[PDB]
Amino acid sequence: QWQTKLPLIAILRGITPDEALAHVGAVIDAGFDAVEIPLNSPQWEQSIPAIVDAYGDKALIGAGTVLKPEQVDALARMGCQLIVTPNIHSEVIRRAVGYGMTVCPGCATATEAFTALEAGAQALKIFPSSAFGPQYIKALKAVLPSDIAVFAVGGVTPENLAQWIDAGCAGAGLGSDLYRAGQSVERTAQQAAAFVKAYREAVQL
Amino acid sequence: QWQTKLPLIAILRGITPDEALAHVGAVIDAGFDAVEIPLNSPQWEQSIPAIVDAYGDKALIGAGTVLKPEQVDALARMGCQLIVTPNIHSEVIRRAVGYGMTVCPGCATATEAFTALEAGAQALKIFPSSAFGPQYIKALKAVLPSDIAVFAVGGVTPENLAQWIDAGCAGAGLGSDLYRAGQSVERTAQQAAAFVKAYREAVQL
Amino acid sequence: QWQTKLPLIAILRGITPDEALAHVGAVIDAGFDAVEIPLNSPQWEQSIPAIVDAYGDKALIGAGTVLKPEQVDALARMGCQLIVTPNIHSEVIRRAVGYGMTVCPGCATATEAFTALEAGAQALKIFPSSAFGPQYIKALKAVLPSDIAVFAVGGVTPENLAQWIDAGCAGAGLGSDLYRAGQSVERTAQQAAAFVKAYREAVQL
Ligand SMILES: *C(C[C@@H](O)[C@H](O)COP(=O)(O)O)C(=O)O
Ligand SMILES: *C(C[C@@H](O)[C@H](O)COP(=O)(O)O)C(=O)O
Ligand SMILES: *C(C[C@@H](O)[C@H](O)COP(=O)(O)O)C(=O)O
């Protein structure tokens, strides 16, 4: 199983250092306990260590769009606990695992999923899930080992979250539908509230 | 070409040893001549050699969800004639080919298909086909070598089988829509009859 | 950026040597400045060098369905300037780059795209785009380096071209909807006119 209370990952792509603390505090306040900042965000090497230090003991804090082994090294030193990727790159996964970090790497096919498992991944991100649909994951779950947690990422909304959870997703990574670069802290708190609400109702249902 | 009379693969995921002979006898009686038991089925190393021995000379008998080279070795000894996979793993394919077994490995992209061909695959499984659609295969067939048999697997029904065959599939692997773990032998005979009927009408049309 | 005026690739699959010059002249006359002949076209080693010689200084001329390193070598000698593929094969890409040819290789997942970039690809073909949709590319563009040109190929029409361009595609490769083996030169001029018109209106809009 995913080892954090609520299985939702807040993905804050394009957030800047001066806004990182407020937006992360918003998502955590609303119920999130996993947050990551993509490495294609401006000055991520300022924002990430800041959020680790403010929130590292309140939420699973980490990074996304992690494409090179050497980034894993840098992120470990920053106190990153979580590595999310758009792709399967075996040494990235192996290296992150080697630090005792939680890795949720991104695959899109059966072949790619089993490569990620062989690299030591304990969870999988299906990215982008929107093109494939809930049924894709349901089909993947019929071949994946039972204890592998699958996360839908890509076009997941508070409205459709239910269908991902029904299909067999342990949870979801939420990007643009939760945070787009330059939206208000109030919008972040609104969307994060919506997703937490949608998740809780989904389990109930 | 596929070298079995009717190009449909019966996939009996989660079948138990005590039910294997009856359900396989049902599908074969209805017209199937390829059957496989996924290795994520309980006690598959009891069911598979049993079905090889009862039916090996009446149908192409084998295994699915074959993920490790060492499983191919074990299955060869059991008298498996057919290896089906959800993914492309070159040594699995090479090893199975090396035994003179029929391999139908699972790919989802052009890149993965050409890797499987280079490993010696003579047929391809597109898995899961449902997310992609008939048109996906039609598009893949415009680049694949002409004599490669393509099998749709994933969300194929007796109702939509026609559209897969029209799109260029040589045949289909049928899983949950044919057999779900714990359904009656009578249900297996019903669904297998439906698929054989749908296939025959599809060629006619 | 793509370094040719209009970012549309004419793909003439199955064209024969005796028709190559007329059909290529049609597409170029209509506004195309990239054209390729797939290597699964009959007698491509006659058609390609012919079109390089007639049109090489009027358009980006090259080949598609390039699957083996040794084909790249042969095509270089023929004066091919452009290599298009259905799949990601690192040495094909590296070899073509090594000749100073423009490579637009085909990928379908994030993992495959980053492999192609690491092989030196400066542009990407998403193939087949039709199964995935415009939103797939939009999602891929959120992780790809900003300056990588993405081309939709597979089920692109003059009617839907707009939506690919809106989604973030720098352009498109047009196959069966532009040229099918055995259609008239007049049909090629008609479809090529339609695509150029659709593209120009798309930028305008
Ligand atoms: C994984 C990719 C993911 O973060 C993208 O932003 C797509 O998700 P949305 O469509 O924005 O929800 C990664 O960055 O590691
Ligand atoms: C291939 C995968 C296949 O067997 C799955 O069960 C999906 O098919 P259905 O959706 O059940 O029809 C393999 O096991 O090798
Ligand atoms: C890339 C594949 C492409 O050329 C195929 O023909 C699919 O495109 P259409 O559906 O025909 O538009 C390659 O050949 O390198």
XYZ file of C-alpha atoms and ligand atoms in Angstrom:
660
model
C 0.000 0.000 0.000
C 0.774 3.714 -0.341
C 2.094 4.709 3.087
C 0.503 8.178 3.350
C -3.003 8.860 4.833
C -4.668 10.332 1.707
C -3.318 8.934 -1.618
C -3.358 12.220 -3.536
C -0.239 13.922 -4.849
C -0.320 17.684 -5.277
C 1.771 18.588 -8.302
C 2.728 22.269 -8.398
C 4.331 22.722 -11.828
C 5.823 26.195 -12.444
C 5.469 27.443 -8.875
C 8.146 30.000 -7.853
C 10.138 30.090 -4.555
C 8.236 33.135 -3.187
C 4.893 31.359 -3.563
C 5.913 27.787 -2.650
C 5.269 27.952 1.115
C 1.775 29.463 0.854
C 0.492 27.128 -1.862
C 1.947 24.049 -0.185
C 0.438 25.170 3.136
C -2.905 25.488 1.342
C -2.870 21.921 -0.035
C -1.669 20.417 3.257
C -4.277 22.379 5.261
C -6.989 20.912 3.014
C -5.858 17.333 3.613
C -3.042 16.506 1.215
C -0.021 14.668 2.579
C 2.002 14.307 -0.589
C 3.302 17.267 -2.550
C 5.903 17.550 -5.271
C 7.458 20.322 -7.308
C 8.454 19.443 -10.902
C 12.080 20.176 -11.813
C 10.859 22.215 -14.772
C 9.593 24.774 -12.218
C 11.677 27.956 -11.955
C 14.335 27.909 -9.204
C 13.155 24.517 -7.879
C 16.428 24.167 -5.917
C 15.168 27.060 -3.783
C 11.526 25.984 -3.450
C 12.080 22.273 -2.686
C 14.485 22.530 0.262
C 12.259 25.327 1.674
C 9.157 23.089 1.595
C 11.035 20.115 3.025
C 11.987 22.300 5.933
C 8.582 23.907 6.530
C 6.435 20.838 5.750
C 8.677 17.709 5.596
C 7.220 16.409 8.868
C 3.624 17.219 7.869
C 3.577 15.702 4.357
C 5.485 13.534 1.909
C 7.588 16.180 0.178
C 9.380 15.744 -3.106
C 10.012 16.443 -6.733
C 8.598 15.658 -10.157
C 9.931 15.481 -13.718
C 13.106 13.860 -12.388
C 14.969 12.781 -15.545
C 18.626 12.364 -14.564
C 20.382 10.239 -11.898
C 22.365 13.324 -10.753
C 19.111 15.154 -9.937
C 18.178 12.354 -7.524
C 21.538 12.919 -5.739
C 20.888 16.685 -5.454
C 17.312 16.117 -4.242
C 18.410 13.608 -1.573
C 20.724 16.243 -0.109
C 17.804 18.731 -0.145
C 15.790 16.235 1.992
C 13.394 15.126 -0.780
C 11.395 12.058 0.351
C 9.487 11.542 -2.872
C 10.553 11.147 -6.514
C 7.903 11.384 -9.281
C 8.782 11.057 -13.006
C 6.997 11.259 -16.368
C 8.977 8.279 -17.671
C 10.686 5.008 -16.706
C 14.439 5.414 -16.405
C 15.829 2.463 -14.466
C 18.830 4.184 -12.785
C 16.711 7.119 -11.671
C 14.365 4.676 -9.981
C 17.195 2.513 -8.603
C 19.062 5.565 -7.313
C 15.997 7.080 -5.619
C 15.139 3.685 -4.065
C 18.796 3.513 -2.953
C 18.243 6.634 -0.814
C 15.122 5.119 0.823
C 12.988 7.694 -1.037
C 9.450 6.885 -2.171
C 9.436 6.606 -5.980
C 6.335 6.871 -8.131
C 7.642 6.709 -11.677
C 5.567 7.262 -14.855
C 4.834 4.537 -17.390
C 2.196 4.187 -20.074
C 2.370 0.540 -21.172
C 2.599 -2.920 -19.599
C 6.220 -3.295 -20.800
C 7.214 -0.013 -19.183
C 5.424 -0.890 -15.906
C 7.365 -4.150 -15.496
C 10.626 -2.374 -16.250
C 9.832 0.082 -13.438
C 9.012 -2.743 -11.019
C 12.322 -4.447 -11.887
C 14.091 -1.193 -11.028
C 12.505 -1.431 -7.552
C 9.443 0.811 -7.943
C 6.797 0.039 -5.300
C 4.159 2.268 -6.905
C 3.331 3.300 -10.518
C 2.126 6.508 -12.155
C 0.135 6.005 -15.364
C 0.884 9.092 -17.385
C -1.023 10.610 -19.079
C -4.035 8.599 -17.856
C -6.593 10.735 -19.772
C -5.753 9.289 -23.182
C -6.097 5.737 -21.870
C -8.993 5.955 -19.408
C -9.950 4.098 -16.183
C -10.403 0.850 -18.140
C -6.734 0.947 -19.161
C -5.678 0.766 -15.527
C -8.286 -1.963 -14.826
C -6.688 -3.931 -17.666
C -3.178 -3.261 -16.321
C -4.220 -4.327 -12.818
C -5.113 -7.764 -14.155
C -1.385 -8.370 -14.867
C 0.401 -6.241 -12.211
C 1.412 -7.752 -8.823
C -1.488 -7.247 -6.372
C 0.382 -4.928 -3.945
C 1.555 -2.397 -6.513
C -0.208 0.950 -5.986
C -1.306 2.568 -9.241
C -1.739 6.335 -9.530
C -3.675 8.042 -12.313
C -1.953 11.267 -13.458
C -3.159 13.378 -16.380
C -6.635 14.853 -16.801
C -7.896 13.744 -13.359
C -10.634 16.033 -11.960
C -12.618 16.114 -8.707
C -15.561 15.024 -10.861
C -13.886 11.973 -12.477
C -11.678 10.938 -9.531
C -14.346 8.406 -8.507
C -13.949 6.498 -11.779
C -10.173 6.172 -11.358
C -10.585 4.835 -7.813
C -13.327 2.402 -9.034
C -11.021 1.176 -11.819
C -8.353 0.190 -9.272
C -6.189 3.263 -8.752
C -4.832 3.552 -5.230
C -4.804 7.324 -5.838
C -3.981 10.209 -8.182
C -1.434 12.892 -8.965
C -3.108 16.230 -9.643
C -1.415 18.868 -11.773
C -2.985 21.643 -13.853
C -6.491 20.912 -12.456
C -5.167 21.637 -8.987
C -2.414 24.213 -9.649
C -1.511 26.215 -12.727
C 1.466 28.619 -12.534
C 0.232 32.020 -11.390
C -3.141 31.139 -9.847
C -4.027 32.521 -6.371
C -3.423 30.738 -3.045
C -7.186 30.879 -2.636
C -7.639 28.899 -5.889
C -5.170 26.271 -4.621
C -7.123 25.923 -1.356
C -10.399 25.669 -3.387
C -9.178 22.974 -5.787
C -7.436 21.000 -3.000
C -10.640 21.083 -0.924
C -12.562 19.808 -3.966
C -10.174 16.884 -4.555
C -10.075 15.835 -0.889
C -13.904 15.990 -0.808
C -14.152 14.013 -4.073
C -11.721 11.375 -2.764
C -13.543 10.934 0.577
C -16.896 10.638 -1.203
C -15.346 8.149 -3.654
C -14.261 5.764 -0.865
C -17.656 6.180 0.801
C -19.339 5.365 -2.545
C -0.128 -16.609 -40.788
C -1.378 -17.929 -37.441
C -1.083 -21.709 -37.761
C -4.266 -22.713 -35.891
C -7.729 -23.143 -37.560
C -9.631 -20.426 -35.633
C -7.460 -17.437 -34.544
C -9.038 -16.963 -31.114
C -7.163 -17.438 -27.857
C -9.157 -18.427 -24.792
C -7.586 -16.786 -21.764
C -8.686 -18.365 -18.482
C -7.256 -16.048 -15.811
C -7.748 -17.268 -12.215
C -9.017 -20.732 -13.115
C -8.171 -23.421 -10.507
C -6.822 -26.968 -11.177
C -10.146 -28.681 -10.294
C -12.022 -26.632 -12.892
C -9.374 -26.435 -15.647
C -10.341 -29.578 -17.597
C -14.071 -28.795 -17.787
C -13.699 -25.153 -18.823
C -11.008 -25.945 -21.380
C -13.169 -28.778 -22.748
C -16.011 -26.263 -23.057
C -13.997 -23.756 -25.125
C -12.487 -26.458 -27.352
C -15.901 -28.101 -27.906
C -17.237 -24.733 -29.104
C -14.463 -24.295 -31.666
C -11.429 -22.794 -29.961
C -8.029 -24.269 -30.752
C -5.842 -22.014 -28.656
C -6.109 -21.808 -24.890
C -3.807 -20.365 -22.268
C -3.753 -20.105 -18.503
C -2.130 -16.960 -17.035
C 0.645 -17.591 -14.501
C -1.192 -15.370 -12.031
C -3.828 -18.142 -11.822
C -3.744 -20.210 -8.620
C -1.709 -23.441 -8.851
C -1.058 -22.970 -12.594
C 1.727 -25.596 -12.420
C -1.042 -28.126 -11.750
C -3.599 -26.859 -14.277
C -1.261 -26.333 -17.264
C 0.383 -29.768 -17.463
C -3.091 -31.324 -16.929
C -4.548 -29.441 -19.924
C -1.530 -30.190 -22.103
C -2.121 -33.839 -21.414
C -5.902 -33.869 -21.904
C -6.052 -31.371 -24.797
C -2.504 -30.796 -26.182
C -3.353 -32.708 -29.367
C -6.738 -30.990 -29.785
C -5.673 -27.349 -29.288
C -2.706 -25.019 -28.976
C -2.148 -25.154 -25.222
C -0.108 -22.697 -23.225
C 0.386 -19.989 -20.681
C -0.100 -16.260 -20.242
C 1.441 -13.510 -18.108
C 4.862 -15.084 -18.649
C 7.287 -12.523 -17.178
C 10.519 -14.390 -16.423
C 12.881 -16.493 -18.594
C 12.852 -19.264 -15.931
C 9.064 -19.614 -16.290
C 9.519 -20.390 -19.995
C 11.916 -23.228 -18.996
C 9.373 -24.660 -16.512
C 6.528 -24.370 -19.041
C 8.531 -26.123 -21.785
C 8.990 -29.111 -19.483
C 5.217 -29.068 -18.786
C 4.621 -29.371 -22.582
C 3.413 -25.778 -23.119
C 3.217 -24.997 -26.866
C 2.155 -21.384 -26.524
C 3.589 -18.398 -24.632
C 1.463 -15.225 -24.242
C 2.711 -12.133 -22.337
C 1.390 -8.703 -21.325
C 4.741 -7.096 -22.155
C 7.812 -7.276 -24.411
C 10.758 -8.884 -22.657
C 13.304 -9.930 -25.268
C 14.803 -12.989 -23.481
C 11.375 -14.371 -22.654
C 10.508 -14.197 -26.335
C 13.915 -15.502 -27.463
C 13.792 -18.351 -24.945
C 10.250 -19.413 -25.887
C 11.156 -19.243 -29.606
C 14.249 -21.315 -28.725
C 11.961 -24.158 -27.584
C 9.958 -24.034 -30.853
C 6.970 -22.681 -28.883
C 4.491 -20.266 -30.457
C 4.963 -16.833 -28.852
C 2.385 -14.064 -28.928
C 3.894 -11.325 -26.800
C 2.128 -8.093 -25.728
C 3.153 -4.640 -26.919
C 1.337 -1.328 -27.016
C 3.485 0.922 -29.223
C 5.345 0.753 -32.541
C 8.719 0.786 -30.722
C 7.707 -2.153 -28.553
C 6.354 -4.121 -31.555
C 9.666 -3.894 -33.438
C 11.572 -4.930 -30.332
C 9.367 -8.039 -30.127
C 9.930 -8.847 -33.806
C 13.705 -8.515 -33.302
C 13.432 -11.029 -30.463
C 11.901 -13.471 -32.982
C 8.168 -12.982 -32.365
C 6.090 -14.162 -35.345
C 2.832 -12.743 -33.976
C 1.912 -9.705 -31.801
C -0.638 -9.076 -29.057
C -1.780 -5.455 -28.747
C -2.575 -5.068 -25.088
C -4.834 -3.542 -23.915
C -6.449 -2.908 -27.321
C -9.563 -1.209 -25.841
C -7.793 2.035 -24.963
C -6.348 2.310 -28.470
C -9.138 1.002 -30.706
C -9.268 -0.823 -34.085
C -7.783 2.229 -35.836
C -4.630 1.916 -33.722
C -3.963 -1.526 -35.157
C -4.814 -0.300 -38.694
C -2.179 2.397 -38.171
C 0.330 -0.144 -36.817
C -0.310 -2.477 -39.756
C 0.845 0.244 -42.136
C 4.387 -0.098 -40.685
C 4.556 -3.772 -39.566
C 5.901 -6.495 -41.924
C 2.959 -7.897 -43.937
C 3.119 -11.468 -42.526
C 3.022 -10.533 -38.852
C -0.267 -11.668 -37.276
C -1.753 -9.073 -34.935
C -4.061 -10.073 -32.082
C -6.346 -7.657 -30.255
C -6.467 -8.395 -26.497
C -8.331 -6.239 -23.982
C -12.012 -5.309 -24.115
C -12.809 -7.503 -27.151
C -16.451 -8.697 -27.219
C -18.466 -10.935 -29.555
C -20.203 -7.715 -30.605
C -17.046 -5.711 -31.469
C -14.895 -8.605 -32.744
C -15.929 -7.714 -36.310
C -14.304 -4.280 -36.041
C -10.968 -5.730 -34.897
C -10.936 -8.201 -37.799
C -11.884 -5.364 -40.244
C -9.040 -3.213 -38.877
C -6.489 -5.923 -39.728
C -6.302 -8.201 -36.699
C -5.616 -11.815 -37.592
C -7.506 -12.685 -34.387
C -8.104 -11.965 -30.697
C -7.273 -13.084 -27.181
C -10.375 -13.191 -24.997
C -10.125 -12.843 -21.231
C -12.721 -11.551 -18.763
C -15.438 -11.385 -21.478
C -15.002 -15.103 -22.023
C -13.951 -16.352 -18.561
C -13.956 -14.692 -15.164
C -12.702 -16.696 -12.148
C -15.625 -18.557 -10.603
C -18.164 -18.505 -13.446
C -19.946 -21.768 -14.424
C -18.800 -24.206 -17.134
C -22.102 -23.416 -18.813
C -21.164 -19.701 -18.968
C -17.810 -20.624 -20.553
C -19.576 -22.725 -23.211
C -22.042 -19.814 -23.818
C -19.387 -17.113 -24.225
C -17.127 -19.373 -26.342
C -20.073 -20.195 -28.628
C -20.768 -16.456 -28.963
C -17.164 -15.623 -29.920
C -16.859 -18.468 -32.443
C -20.195 -17.377 -33.981
C -19.084 -13.717 -34.040
C -15.761 -14.661 -35.669
C -17.374 -16.835 -38.380
C -19.907 -14.103 -39.172
C -17.074 -11.538 -39.256
C -15.158 -13.439 -41.969
C -18.403 -13.965 -43.883
C -19.109 -10.207 -43.617
C 12.060 25.174 -34.064
C 11.389 23.137 -37.211
C 13.641 24.717 -39.841
C 11.298 24.469 -42.855
C 8.732 27.188 -43.849
C 5.529 25.109 -43.488
C 5.715 22.363 -40.793
C 3.823 19.696 -42.740
C 5.373 16.431 -43.873
C 3.924 14.755 -46.946
C 4.131 11.005 -46.472
C 3.730 9.073 -49.725
C 3.496 5.430 -48.619
C 3.396 2.897 -51.488
C 4.207 5.366 -54.257
C 6.095 3.812 -57.218
C 9.151 5.276 -59.054
C 7.145 6.196 -62.200
C 4.716 8.306 -60.172
C 7.105 9.795 -57.581
C 8.098 12.965 -59.472
C 4.542 14.031 -60.355
C 3.049 13.473 -56.900
C 5.972 15.140 -55.146
C 5.739 18.068 -57.583
C 2.043 18.315 -56.702
C 2.628 18.554 -52.932
C 5.517 21.014 -53.303
C 3.527 23.192 -55.745
C 0.743 23.421 -53.145
C 3.096 24.612 -50.408
C 4.735 21.604 -48.788
C 8.460 21.755 -48.106
C 8.952 18.396 -46.451
C 8.283 15.118 -48.212
C 9.250 11.562 -47.385
C 8.825 8.162 -48.967
C 8.430 5.202 -46.567
C 10.889 2.339 -47.092
C 7.951 -0.052 -47.346
C 7.143 1.628 -50.692
C 8.008 -0.431 -53.782
C 11.441 0.315 -55.296
C 12.081 3.202 -52.864
C 15.798 3.132 -53.789
C 14.710 4.363 -57.227
C 12.103 6.916 -56.122
C 14.078 8.585 -53.298
C 17.283 9.503 -55.149
C 15.100 10.718 -58.070
C 13.148 13.102 -55.802
C 16.293 14.319 -54.058
C 17.634 15.253 -57.445
C 14.486 16.896 -58.831
C 13.312 18.547 -55.587
C 16.146 18.414 -52.980
C 16.707 22.171 -53.283
C 12.976 22.980 -53.193
C 11.935 20.863 -50.180
C 13.209 18.785 -47.283
C 13.419 15.380 -48.951
C 13.690 12.080 -47.156
C 12.470 8.702 -46.084
C 10.073 7.097 -43.632
C 9.756 3.728 -41.889
C 13.528 3.692 -41.394
C 14.118 0.690 -39.104
C 17.767 -0.310 -39.536
C 21.061 1.609 -39.114
C 22.245 0.317 -42.534
C 19.246 1.966 -44.233
C 20.367 5.342 -42.861
C 23.792 4.753 -44.509
C 22.161 3.923 -47.876
C 19.821 6.930 -47.643
C 22.679 9.335 -46.829
C 24.423 8.282 -50.037
C 21.137 8.859 -51.933
C 21.128 12.475 -50.598
C 18.276 12.003 -48.089
C 18.035 15.048 -45.774
C 15.218 13.755 -43.608
C 14.709 10.544 -41.613
C 11.215 9.710 -40.258
C 10.491 6.508 -38.266
C 7.490 4.779 -36.672
C 9.569 3.843 -33.621
C 12.469 4.901 -31.380
C 15.651 3.025 -32.212
C 18.590 4.879 -30.689
C 21.298 3.971 -33.264
C 19.037 4.851 -36.173
C 18.538 8.277 -34.640
C 22.211 8.657 -33.664
C 23.368 7.550 -37.113
C 21.001 9.893 -38.976
C 22.012 12.788 -36.680
C 25.640 11.799 -37.388
C 25.080 12.581 -41.089
C 23.607 16.027 -40.273
C 20.190 14.759 -41.440
C 16.966 16.032 -39.876
C 15.433 13.213 -37.805
C 11.808 13.079 -36.729
C 11.470 9.730 -35.005
C 8.190 8.164 -33.780
C 7.364 7.602 -30.120
C 4.103 7.043 -28.293
C 4.948 7.455 -24.598
C 6.910 9.822 -22.351
C 9.593 7.146 -21.771
C 10.075 6.660 -25.499
C 10.221 10.439 -26.145
C 13.080 10.944 -23.668
C 14.961 8.007 -25.148
C 14.695 9.678 -28.569
C 15.921 13.009 -27.189
C 18.906 11.244 -25.580
C 19.734 9.780 -28.990
C 19.933 13.369 -30.308
C 16.456 13.838 -31.805
C 15.574 17.537 -32.162
C 11.947 16.856 -33.105
C 9.388 14.129 -32.200
C 6.652 12.313 -34.109
C 3.766 11.070 -31.955
C 2.564 7.986 -33.748
C -0.253 7.118 -34.091
C -1.651 10.373 -32.654
C -5.311 9.445 -33.373
C -5.580 6.917 -30.551
C -4.186 9.417 -28.048
C -5.671 12.741 -29.160
C -4.529 16.406 -29.000
C -4.706 16.336 -25.185
C -2.055 13.601 -25.107
C 0.434 15.912 -26.785
C -0.613 18.818 -24.506
C 0.169 16.527 -21.569
C 3.503 15.483 -23.111
C 4.439 19.114 -23.766
C 4.211 19.820 -20.045
C 7.266 17.552 -19.506
C 9.226 17.877 -22.797
C 11.998 20.512 -23.192
C 10.412 23.724 -24.550
C 12.286 23.759 -27.905
C 11.389 20.238 -28.987
C 9.050 20.328 -32.006
C 6.227 17.800 -31.761
C 4.537 16.413 -34.873
C 1.175 14.653 -34.856
C 1.124 11.684 -37.277
C -1.807 9.286 -37.612
C -5.403 10.232 -38.389
C -4.664 13.946 -38.958
C -7.125 15.606 -41.383
C -7.460 19.114 -42.837
C -10.520 19.395 -40.591
C -8.810 18.404 -37.301
C -5.361 19.900 -38.006
C -6.386 23.014 -36.049
C -6.824 20.994 -32.850
C -3.339 19.468 -33.103
C -1.764 22.903 -33.599
C -3.831 24.293 -30.645
C -2.662 21.400 -28.445
C 0.992 22.331 -29.042
C 2.069 20.467 -32.167
C 4.617 22.362 -34.228
C 3.182 20.487 -37.233
C 1.971 17.190 -38.701
C 2.947 14.268 -40.895
C 0.177 13.389 -43.336
C -0.128 9.894 -44.768
C -3.223 8.089 -46.055
C -5.374 11.263 -45.774
C -3.016 12.972 -48.188
C -1.780 10.076 -50.364
C -2.953 6.499 -50.718
C -1.112 4.206 -53.174
C -2.758 4.475 -56.582
C -4.687 7.747 -56.252
C -4.409 10.372 -59.046
C -1.923 13.273 -59.138
C -4.987 15.500 -59.122
C -6.117 13.965 -55.794
C -2.648 14.622 -54.326
C -2.814 18.280 -55.414
C -6.371 18.521 -53.927
C -5.491 17.033 -50.532
C -2.206 18.996 -50.300
C -4.074 22.234 -51.082
C -6.585 21.367 -48.340
C -3.876 20.748 -45.717
C -1.908 23.903 -46.567
C -5.171 25.906 -46.400
C -6.133 24.253 -43.088
C -2.677 24.965 -41.628
C -2.670 28.648 -42.682
C -6.173 29.138 -41.272
C -5.101 27.362 -38.062
C -2.242 29.822 -37.413
C -4.550 32.722 -38.272
C -7.133 31.327 -35.808
C 4.560 13.649 -14.063
C 3.642 14.415 -15.044
C 2.505 15.329 -14.539
O 2.986 16.048 -13.434
C 1.982 16.315 -15.614
O 1.875 17.648 -15.130
C 0.592 15.894 -16.114
O -0.421 16.026 -15.102
P -1.650 17.064 -15.282
O -2.321 16.879 -16.633
O -1.137 18.481 -15.163
O -2.675 16.835 -14.192
C 5.846 14.319 -13.491
O 6.020 15.529 -13.574
O 6.742 13.659 -12.924
C -2.129 -10.821 -21.622
C -3.221 -9.955 -20.951
C -4.708 -10.371 -20.970
O -4.772 -11.755 -20.743
C -5.570 -9.630 -19.918
O -6.399 -10.510 -19.170
C -6.485 -8.595 -20.589
O -7.503 -9.205 -21.401
P -9.072 -9.039 -21.036
O -9.424 -7.577 -20.814
O -9.386 -9.830 -19.787
O -9.919 -9.580 -22.168
C -1.439 -11.978 -20.837
O -1.915 -12.407 -19.793
O -0.385 -12.514 -21.238
C 5.636 6.941 -39.646
C 4.198 6.383 -39.762
C 3.156 7.027 -40.702
O 3.803 7.361 -41.902
C 1.944 6.110 -41.001
O 1.633 6.045 -42.387
C 0.687 6.605 -40.270
O 0.213 7.864 -40.780
P -1.236 7.983 -41.491
O -2.318 7.363 -40.622
O -1.202 7.285 -42.831
O -1.572 9.441 -41.723
C 6.755 6.463 -40.620
O 6.482 5.862 -41.651
O 7.965 6.675 -40.395
